[PDB]
Symmetry: D2
């Protein structure tokens, strides 16, 4: 049946977060074997035990290049081949540019971009070897439009898209796809503040985690074998590309 | 269970060949009741899929026939939930040599019949608080392409039209979204990183995605399904 | 000097309107011979008389295909060949889609999209033979973003970008570029909702568009084709 | 004369390479006081000696965070306020993704992106205080289209646009614009060619004019954009 993912192996980073949890759940529901990454192991084994079978758990700190490298090799080995890498984990250090410290720029780049670079590198050669794979990168509406307060975040998320494009071209012949999803504003750790944003969402409501989760399922499906290099916007029409 | 359209009523224009037919098949496979538009007897496709099918011939060049088309499908299906604007033509050739007819014609089908048909179905979808409009544009609407000044206009305008309508009817839970097929000769293969032509099923799948309840929060967008030929 | 336009011949459509006159003045001041299109010929003469030397007057109703063809021909012959075409005139028939008329769609389509086609068709061949030319199309922010109550306008301004892209690819080799400019909002509940979305917090003036025309029309922009220049206060960032 | 820059103070990074030089020339021919950054000092003093006066020379190693900051401080002080910053210098560490080392990523991001962060952070506040500024970032078509062999570069160049959009939104009301130019541009040099409608390579002056346009008073209503100068290779 359509969009089936039975037997497919997925690794989802930031899998205890709002979106990562939701994505993990959806992959599982479609029959995937799901590896869940997180910073805290306790929160992870908790999502595990709740989903039942076909779950692996991989704690690691994404700041830490060497743990990211290990995260890759672990997943690939325990899972017996990762078919689906979802790069969802990502941090913020918001503030005005003219007050923005090196440490706030660095941390965001090294997490949102370079840990994506190293994890993806651990898993792409294997995927290519197998002639099958999906690399799905959670960017943000903000990487396309820009946003005040987030010079670092927007850079990291626009860059994520252009990394995605370059890789996609390079590995398309080997039946491995790479695509981005761009969430608008989604219910999470987050009234005037809120009203200003809602006035630009034509659909006049916030997003939910299922909205991103289902876009992941779509892109990871066989049926999406011919989509690579693209950015799928999920945002109630907040920005229309 | 995921991406289930059982009981939802969909109209696909240009359902007789190529993408329309593949789109219609996937809609059918997912439970939808599928109204089949085409220019010519179509009765064959109807007979292949059997149950949950309607047949609506019309000439899309005839604004009157497009109005009736929409009034008829709305009426006989008990309300269209999914409109797929698929049908479209080309009158290719260099800009210098391009007839007023070749311009007029392409715009009349690819743009204005879409204006008209959609206008027929939008209010009813609004009043039901539910609706999908999915428009098949083209890679060439975004990239431009020689020999196709008229086509590219129509396809580019199709996107533009969709965004604006997307903003108006969002609060009534009707989405509107484009799908940009790629190519669907080794000059063409050269520029496709995936080194294959697309097939109908690749576009039909994207239709189902966008048409699904799970895409309620997607609107105003263009989904490129193109082997990586142009990356936006 | 740079961005010098002396010796060049321009036709500007809707030259009497806000963007058109600004566009005309800036081309003129940069040395160009400008042909002013409009519908109300008496408004053309007023502009001419103010501007003096290096001016032609070409009244024409752009809703009239025949007149659009004749307009091209007359500008081509009388000006001694047109070097720069600025497709600027364009109408609105605003309103909610579900209320929109057959005539409300077709009239925007035929002015904003097909008269551009015919006019441009009239002058490209000449520019191709001379192996030098500039087609410059005034699109709009909303053609890229979309905007409610403007499904017809948005279709026409997105299509015009698509129009330009295809044409740009055809004639690039014969040194005629074709580009679009996308103005944002240009010169009290409606107003300041718009203003709330412009980070620069001011409206745009005709001179902001006029400068982008001069930039694209210049020899210095020979390697620019098929593009869209946004001049919008940072309202939309492409 | 339209697009006059007389008295405006500009700082150009990578001013010895092809693009940087043409940019420097065009700013200086349009009346601007131009400070020339470059890795190699010999070529700077050469180019500085060639153009009249209204030239300052500041060598710096952009891989060195502290030298980046010192470049900014020195250009702000020695020219008594920079008006126009052209972030042009960038590097490549090309190679297939699957063989790309930690350093080939790291070196590409530190220069093309994070040294741009620093430099720009050194000068924007001063610009905002003076109610006037131009930030002009040289990105690349590849940042938009993507390109095999250039995963690191594509990331940095894409990142560069995103950063520009964000900073542009923050400071627009202060009359400082921030914009990107995207240039396009063995003999499978002929494969690139066929894909260019204009059937021609980019030269420096094509990019140099786009900079003068964006640096002008006339481009004051333009902020947060990417100007493609690529002969139709990609049409956005």
């Amino acid at each position: 049946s359509m969009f089936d993912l039975t037997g497919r192996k997925a690794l989802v980073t930031g899998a205890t977060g709002g979106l990562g949890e939701a994505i993990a759940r959806a992959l599982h529901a479609q029959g995937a074997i799901v590896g869940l990454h997180g910073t805290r192991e306790e929160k992870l084994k908790e999502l595990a035990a709740e989903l039942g079978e076909r779950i692996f758990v991989f704690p690691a700190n994404l700041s830490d290049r060497e743990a990211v490298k290990a995260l890759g090799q672990k997943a690939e080995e325990e899972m017996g081949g990762v078919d689906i890498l979802v790069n969802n984990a990502g941090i913020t250090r918001d503030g005005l540019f003219v007050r923005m410290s090196d440490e706030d720029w660095d941390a965001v780049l090294t997490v949102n971009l370079t840990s994506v670079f190293n994890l993806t590198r651990e898993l792409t050669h294997p995927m290519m070897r197998r002639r099958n794979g999906r690399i799905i990168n959670i960017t943000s509406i903000v990487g396309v439009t820009g946003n005040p307060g987030q010079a670092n975040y927007c850079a990291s998320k626009a860059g994520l898209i252009g990394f995605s494009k370059s890789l996609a071209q390079e590995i398309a012949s080997r039946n491995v796809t790479v695509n981005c999803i761009a969430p608008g504003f989604i219910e999470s750790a987050m009234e005037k503040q809120k009203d200003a944003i809602m006035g630009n969402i034509p659909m006049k409501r916030m997003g939910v985690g299922a909205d991103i989760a289902a876009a992941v399922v779509y892109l990871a499906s066989d049926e999406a074998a011919y989509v690579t290099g693209q950015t799928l916007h999920v945002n109630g029409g907040m920005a229309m590309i």
